[PDB]
Every structure is written in C-alpha cells, then in structure tokens.
Design a protein around this ligand. Structure first.
Ligand SMILES: *[C@@H]1O[C@H](CO[C@@H]2O[C@@H](C)[C@@H](O)[C@@H](O)[C@@H]2O)[C@@H](O[C@@H]2O[C@H](CO)[C@@H](O[C@@H]3O[C@H](CO)[C@@H](O[C@@H]4O[C@H](CO)[C@@H](O)[C@H](O)[C@@H]4O)[C@H](O)[C@@H]3O)[C@H](O)[C@H]2NC(C)=O)[C@H](O)[C@H]1NC(C)=O
Ligand SMILES: *[C@@H]1O[C@H](CO)[C@@H](O[C@@H]2O[C@H](CO)[C@@H](O[C@@H]3O[C@H](CO)[C@@H](O)[C@H](O)[C@@H]3O)[C@H](O)[C@H]2NC(C)=O)[C@H](O)[C@H]1NC(C)=O
Ligand SMILES: *[C@@H]1O[C@H](CO)[C@@H](O[C@@H]2O[C@H](CO)[C@@H](O)[C@H](O)[C@H]2NC(C)=O)[C@H](O)[C@H]1NC(C)=O
Ligand SMILES: *[C@@H]1O[C@H](CO[C@@H]2O[C@@H](C)[C@@H](O)[C@@H](O)[C@@H]2O)[C@@H](O)[C@H](O)[C@H]1NC(C)=O
Ligand SMILES: *[C@@H]1O[C@H](CO)[C@@H](O)[C@H](O)[C@H]1NC(C)=O
Ligand SMILES: [Cl-]
Ligand SMILES: [Zn+2]
Lengths: 594, 193
C-alpha cells in the first residue's frame, strides 16, 4: 500500500507538470495582454488544472496517510488530500462563487462622486487613494473615508453575511472548527516530534509576540499623534485615539504617507536620490544585472536565460496592454520570469531585489517533488524578498555600487529619519494586521453576533490599534469588507508573521556575515557564509516543516519578536525621550464626534 | 567512410523508451568531427580517452540515438538510478564508450508543444544493460486486475515530454548519441588513420 502511493504520485507529479505549466503559460499571456481572447484561454487552462486537483485530491484521500513511513512521501500525499474541500451543494458553491465574484467586482468598480462637483466621480485606485495619501484637509479626507464605507461598504454588508455562512459550512464539513480554523491550518504541523504546531498555538503566539510590540507602538503612536496635532489642529486630542481618516491611506494599514508630517529631522536631505539617480539612467538590464550580482556575491546562482528572454523588464510599445503589479513568476519546467511596470526609478530598484528574491526561492526548491515546491509557510516568501530590499537600501551598498556620493554624511539624525520612515510602514501595520484577523477569527468562530459586527470592530480599533472612527457606523456598514484582502477572501495574518520572520532572517544572515554595527546598517553583500545559511532554507521548500526550515537559518522553532525590536531599538530610545512630555497610551472613549 | 553523419545529423530522432541502434563496421572513422565542435554540449567518454581514441582500432561501434530533457542527460552514465536509466536506457557498469549530447530546442521544441517524445514511467523490474522495452500494456501497481482499460492503480506506462521553447535548460530537449565501443576476438574492423 505504501508502494501504491509512490506510483500514484509519480503520475500526479508528471501530469501536474503539464497542466500547471499550460495554465501558467496561459495566465502569463493575459497579464501581458488583457484581451478577452487571452482572458478565455487563461481561464480554460486554469479550469483544466483545477478539475485535475478535484479528482486527484479525492483519489489521494483513498490512500491512508498513517500507513506511510517515508516522511517525504507522507508529506506529499497529505498536501493533495488536504486540497480536497469538495463538500458542498453544487448550487450553494455556485452561489458562494457568485458572492465572492460580486464582492470583488463591487470593490474593484466601486465609485464615489464629489457632492460639491458631481462631475468628479472617483473610484478607489486612483482617486480616493490619492486623497487619503496626499490631502491635508480633514473634511476632504473624512468624505473619501466615509464614502468608501457608506457606498461600496454597505453593498458588501449583506454579501459578507452570506459569505460567512457558506464558508463556515464548507469548513465545518472538513473537520474544521470554522473558516478561521481553515486559514490557520497553514501553520499546523501534525507529526514530526519536537517540531509540531497547532491551529490554536498561532493565536497564542501572535498575541504573545504582539504584547512585546505594544511599548514600541505606543511610543510611535504618541509621537505621531503629537505631530498630527500640529497638522490638524483642534481635531485631535492629546490623550485620545487617532481618527481613521488621518492615517495616510483608506484604512490606516500603513503610516508611510505620514512621513512628511512626522519627519524627525526634516532639514537633512533624503537618501532617495531617485531624481538624480534617474540621470544615471543606465538601463533596465543594468538594474536587474545589479540585482543579479547581489545574489551572486552572496553565493546564489545567476538568473536563468529564460529570465533575460521571456520576462517583462520594461514596457514594450503602446499597442500592447500590460498589467502593472510587480510579480515574480515560477511557471514550472525551469521557466522563471518577472513582470513589473518599472522605469528608471529607485523605489522599484528595491522591489527588483524583492521580486528577484522570490525567484531565488523558487529556483532553489525546484529539486523537490511537485507537491513540495512552495515556501515553508505563507509568510516565508515575503520575508525572503523583504530582506533583499532591506540590504540593498543601506548607504554602504549604495556607495559601493556607484549610486550614492562616496562621501555621504551619516549623522545620528539621518539614522532616525530612516528608521522612523521604516517604523511607520513596518511597525504601524502590526496592530492593524493582528486586530483585523482577530476580528475575522472571532466572527468565523461565532463569537461576534451579526448585530454587533461594527460595534466590536470599532471597539477593537480603539483598544488594539488606538484608532477611533470619525463618524459613528451602525450595523448597515461593513468597514472590514472595504479592504481588498477581506472582501476578496484572503487570509491576513501572513503579513504579521512574515514581518517577524524577515527580521529573524536578517539578524541570522547578518550574524553569519559577522556584521559589526546596528542591524539596520547591515548589508549581506559579498557574504558567501550568509548565503549558505539562507540557501539551506530556500532549498527545503515545503518538504520539511516550517519550524525546521526556520530553525535552519535563525535557530528557533517559532516566531521571535526580539529581532524586530532590536532593529528599531535606536528609534525606540529616541521615541521614549521625545514622549517624556507627551502622553503614551490612549483613552478608548474619546471620539471626534459627540 | 563511417556513416556518422547519418546518426548525428539525422532528421528524426527516436524516443528514449524506443531508442534506436545502428551497427557500424568496416570503415575509416574520423572522430575529429566530434571533439572539435562546440555543437556537442556534453561528450563524456567512459572507459576510453576522448582524444586518444582517434589512433585506436576496434571491432564495431554501436551508435544509440534517443532524446531526453536536459536534467535527464546525467542518467546516461554507468551506475545511475533515475527513470531514464531504470526503465528506458541503462548503461552497464563496465561501459566502454562515449556519451554525446547537444541542445535541440530550435529543432525538437515547438511553441504549441512537442509531445512526440515519450518515455517509460512505470515498469515491474529494472532494465538490464542495453535492454529495450516497447510494451504499452497497462501497468498494474495494485492487486485488482486492470484488464485492458485504465483506472484505479492501473496506469498507462508511457509518458510524453513537453518541449516548448520557454522551458528552462533542464527541461529543454537534448539529442543523445551513445557511442558504444567493444572488441570481440577479432579486434580490427574500424579504426582511425
Ligand atoms: C490546492 O492546491 C492549489 C494548487 O497548488 C498546487 O499544489 C500545492 C501542493 C503546491 O505544490 C503548489 O505549488 C501547486 O501549484 C492551490 O491553488 C494555487 O495556490 C498557489 C499558491 O499555493 C497560487 O499561486 C501563487 O500563490 C502565491 C501565494 O504566496 C502568490 O504569491 C506570489 O508569489 C510570487 C513568487 O513567484 C511573487 O511574485 C509574489 O510574492 C506573489 O505574492 C501568487 O500570487 C500566486 O497566486 C495559485 O494562484 C493557486 N491557484 C488556484 C487555481 O487555486 C490551492 O490554494 C490549494 N487549496 C488548498 C490548500 O486549500
Ligand atoms: C553535420 O553537419 C555539420 C555542418 O552543419 C558538419 O560539420 C562540418 O564537418 C566537415 C567535415 O565533415 C568540416 O569540414 C572540414 O572543415 C575543416 C575546418 O574546420 C577543414 O580544414 C577541412 O578541410 C574540412 O573541410 C566542416 O568545417 C564542418 N562545418 C560545420 C559548420 O560544422 C558535420 O561534419 C556533419 N556530421 C556530423 C556532425 O556527424
Ligand atoms: C564586494 O562588493 C563591492 C560592492 O558592494 C565590490 O566593490 C566594487 O567592485 C567594482 C568592480 O569589482 C569596482 O568598480 C567598485 O569600485 C567597487 N566598489 C568600491 C566601493 O570600490 C567588490 O568587488 C566586492 N568584492 C570584494 C571582494 O570586495
Ligand atoms: C502581447 O501580445 C503580443 C502579440 O500577441 C498577439 O496579440 C495580443 C494582442 C494577443 O491577442 C495575443 O493573444 C496574440 O497572440 C506579443 O508580441 C507580446 O509579447 C505580448 N506581451 C506584451 C507585454 O506585449
Ligand atoms: C554566472 O556568471 C559568471 C560570470 O559569467 C559565470 O562564471 C558563472 O558560471 C555563472 N553561473 C551560472 C550561469 O550559474
Ligand atoms: Cl475600517
Ligand atoms: Zn514580492
């Protein structure tokens, strides 16, 4: 019986190569040409690959998982068996897919019109996002914030209600507690002694690690609030929460756009020499060849010939449509490319190292069998790509490449400016991410009644995130669904886990590189020792459990907040002194309304 | 004088599961056409020297032709245990010849996909050195009989390569020619001048 699974997977692995590569080749043509001709061809090849997974997963369950001894073989059959969630009515699943498509269309096509000038009707991107990121008018931002939740937000309320019912019915039929328990299975390690992990242990570890982030976030909140009181006078209380429409985007997921209002030492020049670095045009090939030499110096292989022949490295002509999201592609059969709408700027140069980090990960685990070609968990890929742009942004690397002036002055004030910009993006999103998943987890678990969704949502915003709603929202609203990841059915805890992982990786690779100064000044270039430690994790794929793959690089079997907190320690001590005459913490009772 | 171009520069090349054999004897071998070429990408001579063989005499040469992907070329060597080396073409541990291979993506790969080249994926036992198997009988991995129809634990033995020009080097079509040298009791029939 153990030999039967071997012959079964040996056909699955080779028939998957066919359908996965054809569905990936067809998917590429749509992203390189948006035309109904390609939209239908892409979907057809994807439908074949989907129907394949239907039958193969049912057949995979017929073999007993526990009757297998080979760990690598047992792990392969499990992935196929766990892929079978076909326990619903053909009509109700058809409606669930209709609900999932309706919410996606409402979110992507939702438009709001300016009440002063109805000629200007704005959708989310671009428009409302430009208002939430650049406007300094309290009322203008309040309009866009409230409109997106009162128009498209309310339309998603009934859909999300039925979305929860159908998703929980699907999960409970697969021996899951709820749909939240379903998503949490990506971290579950059932088997291998000493390396296990449960679908509830994540909840405990996420809340534990978040408790150590509270002091750092409380001081970033206090510093931002004080700076925002000067920007929006008479609108913010020195002891209350921050109004949601003043956080830099539609939801407050990132405080990146608040840097202009919260810059510590604005008189120092910014290291983003994008304008003058455009004059150093070079070419798109030079940008990615520089990214290539980064990984080559660390001991990783060069980019494949298919990358230089089959990838979108610029923007061809005008008669050819192209989607502009940056993506790295591992289509299979050795086909590696990157598609990204990039010019000769500098912020994409960091993302170029990020996306090429995804390719290096995809290249390394290609030796593993088909079912095992994936990151250790959902957070492993993004953490790998983030440390590349993390090292490629240091002044030392920029000096040695010939991009920054050879005599740049690194004061202790320019160090705070950079770290503060990082904290607004990296640390500001941690309470937002955890609180959002904490709300969805409790809703799926049936702990939040339907008549208390928005009441519990904003009760947690004021306590966990320290953000108060500007206008009261009754149960007709559905502000969670006003975010892409919520209404488009995507787990969100991956952004919290990868953020802790990426600093564990960087700390491990910089210690392997024997970095001297602070962690934020580390660049693992020319460090073959750091690459060997990283490569030992990339080559594993999803073969070994995520706890072991994490242990191979950082030395731990679980998340760790210490590397993240040590990265921001120079800023944390500076924030504690800046807030000595302020008020750290917030009252959950103050609101901009009455 | 030896028909080497008829084997290397041959138009159609066979599948690895149904590899072909050509027996060459009584001619004047010019091995300089082979080792003085960037055309070949591998050329690993086991048992003999790739250069010294030009001034050596043998009895007959057996040129074996077939096609495998780039990652399957490393199995065409003495002592290998992959799928090609187990079910398609096994070289003996005492092999005395040269294995030549070169990339043929522009010839053996089409944008629509070249599914012509096939290989045997399942077999009861392994292949003895230089054995061949053309059977298309439904492989039975379980106990329940398979009759002639496919189905549960009943799999067709032959699988086909997918040769598209966007595949990586490891998945691109390579044409392999396994020159097998031997000497019987009569040691001189083909030799270099
Ligand atoms: C059931 O399985 C299918 C198919 O997965 C297959 O089987 C598993 C065991 C693995 O071997 C897979 O390699 C194999 O294809 C699942 O559907 C697909 O799931 C994959 C990912 O699991 C989706 O592809 C990608 O998903 C990434 C998740 O991080 C996305 O991230 C990108 O990463 C690239 C790196 O190159 C970068 O450019 C970016 O960082 C980017 O974020 C990526 O966008 C891409 O979508 C794929 O879309 C899914 N397709 C379908 C048709 O579902 C399915 O989820 C699973 N169901 C379960 C487990 O319940
Ligand atoms: C398969 O076809 C190739 C051509 O595509 C053949 O290569 C040619 O081989 C001949 C000998 O058979 C070479 O001629 C010799 O060239 C040298 C100089 O290199 C010259 O000094 C000699 O006098 C003689 O003319 C020829 O150069 C060579 N050309 C190319 C382009 O390779 C090959 O022989 C054919 N057969 C095989 C590979 O078995
Ligand atoms: C280490 O990395 C640096 C760059 O990060 C490399 O130094 C550059 O090398 C190029 C050509 O090799 C020179 O044109 C540059 O002038 C060098 N930079 C500086 C600042 O001088 C270096 O080659 C890498 N390897 C070693 C061993 O140092
Ligand atoms: C886009 O397509 C170009 C030509 O392909 C053909 O025309 C497009 C409009 C589609 O209908 C496609 O199905 C056709 O086969 C390609 O030359 C080009 O590389 C493609 N990608 C980009 C980014 O231009
Ligand atoms: C990477 O490029 C260098 C320089 O050309 C080369 O020596 C090395 O073999 C290459 N590595 C590959 C292609 O894996
Ligand atoms: Cl919200
Ligand atoms: Zn990425």
């Amino acid at each position: 019986t153990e030999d039967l699974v071997n012959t079964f997977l040996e056909k699955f692995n080779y028939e998957a190569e066919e359908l996965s590569y054809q569905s990936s080749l067809a998917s590429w043509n749509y992203n390189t040409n948006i035309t109904e001709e390609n939209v239908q061809n892409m979907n057809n090849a994807g439908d074949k690959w989907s129907a394949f997974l239907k039958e193969q997963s049912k057949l995979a369950k017929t073999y007993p998982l526990e009757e297998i001894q080979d760990s690598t073989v047992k792990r392969q059959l499990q992935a196929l068996q766990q892929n079978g969630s076909s326990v619903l009515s053909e009509d109700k699943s058809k409606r669930l897919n209709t609900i999932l498509n309706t919410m996606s269309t409402i979110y992507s096509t939702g438009k709001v019109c300016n009440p002063d000038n109805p000629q200007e009707c704005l959708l989310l991107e671009p428009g409302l996002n430009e208002i939430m990121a650049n406007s300094l008018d309290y009322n203008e931002r309040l309009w866009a914030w409230e409109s997106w939740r009162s128009e498209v937000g309310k339309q998603l309320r009934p859909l999300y209600e039925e979305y929860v019912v159908l998703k929980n019915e699907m999960a409970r039929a697969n021996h899951y507690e709820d749909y939240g328990d379903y998503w949490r299975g990506d971290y579950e390690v059932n088997g291998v002694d000493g390396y296990d992990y449960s679908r509830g242990q994540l909840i405990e570890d996420v809340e534990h690690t978040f408790e150590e982030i509270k002091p750092l976030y409380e001081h970033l909140h206090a510093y931002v609030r004080a700076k925002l009181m000067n920007a929006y006078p008479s609108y913010i209380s020195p002891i209350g929460c921050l109004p949601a429409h003043l956080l830099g985007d539609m939801w407050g997921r990132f405080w990146t756009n608040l840097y202009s209002l919260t810059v510590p030492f604005g008189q120092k020049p910014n290291i983003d020499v994008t304008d003058a670095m455009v004059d150093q045009a070079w070419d798109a090939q030079r940008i990615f060849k520089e990214a290539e030499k980064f990984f080559v110096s660390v001991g990783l292989p060069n980019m494949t010939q298919g990358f230089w022949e089959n990838s979108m490295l610029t923007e061809p002509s005008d008669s050819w449509k192209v989607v502009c999201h940056p993506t790295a592609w591992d289509l299979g059969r050795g086909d590696f490319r990157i598609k990204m709408c990039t010019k000769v700027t500098m912020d994409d140069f960091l993302t170029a190292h990020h996306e090429m980090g995804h390719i290096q990960y995809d290249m390394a685990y290609a030796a593993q069998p088909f079912l095992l070609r994936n990151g250790a968990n959902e957070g492993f890929h993004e953490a790998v790509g983030e440390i590349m742009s993390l090292s490629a942004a240091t002044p030392k690397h920029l000096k040695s490449i010939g991009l920054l002036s050879p005599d740049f002055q690194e004061d202790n004030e320019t160090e705070i400016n950079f770290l503060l910009k990082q904290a607004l993006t990296i640390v500001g999103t941690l309470p937002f991410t955890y609180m959002l998943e904490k709300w969805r987890w409790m809703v799926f678990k049936g702990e939040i009644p339907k008549d208390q969704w928005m009441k519990k949502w904003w009760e947690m915003k004021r306590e966990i995130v320290g953000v108060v709603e500007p206008v009261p929202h009754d149960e007709t609203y559905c502000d969670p669904a006003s975010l892409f990841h919520v209404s488009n059915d995507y787990s969100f805890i991956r952004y919290y886990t990868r953020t802790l992982y990426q600093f564990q990786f960087q700390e491990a690779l910089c210690q392997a590189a024997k970095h001297e100064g602070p962690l934020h000044k580390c660049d693992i270039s020319n460090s073959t020792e750091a690459g060997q430690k990283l490569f030992n994790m990339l080559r594993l794929g999803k073969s070994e459990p995520w706890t072991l793959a994490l242990e191979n690089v950082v030395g731990a079997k679980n998340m760790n907040v210490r590397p993240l907190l040590n990265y921001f320690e120079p800023l944390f001590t500076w924030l504690k002194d800046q807030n000595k005459n302020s008020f750290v913490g917030w009252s959950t009772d103050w609101s901009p309304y009455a | 004088l030896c028909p080497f171009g008829e084997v290397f520069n041959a138009t159609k090349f066979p599948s690895v599961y149904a590899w072909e054999r050509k027996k060459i004897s009584n001619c004047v071998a010019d091995y300089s056409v082979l080792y003085n070429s960037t055309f070949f990408s591998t050329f690993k001579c086991y048992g003999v020297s790739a250069t010294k063989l030009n001034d050596l005499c043998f009895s007959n040469v057996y040129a074996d032709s077939f096609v495998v992907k780039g990652d399957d070329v490393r199995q065409i060597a003495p002592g290998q245990t992959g799928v090609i080396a187990d079910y398609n073409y096994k070289l003996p541990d005492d092999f005395m010849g040269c294995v030549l291979a070169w990339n043929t993506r522009n010839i053996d790969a089409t944008s629509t996909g070249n599914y012509n080249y096939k290989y045997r994926l399942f077999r009861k036992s392994n292949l003895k050195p230089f054995e061949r198997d053309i059977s298309t009988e439904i492989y039975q991995a379980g106990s329940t009989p398979c009759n002639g129809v496919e189905g549960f634990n009943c799999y067709f033995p032959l699988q086909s390569y997918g040769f598209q020009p966007t595949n990586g080097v490891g998945y691109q079509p390579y044409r392999v020619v396994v020159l097998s040298f031997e000497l019987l009791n009569a040691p001189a029939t083909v030799c270099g001048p």
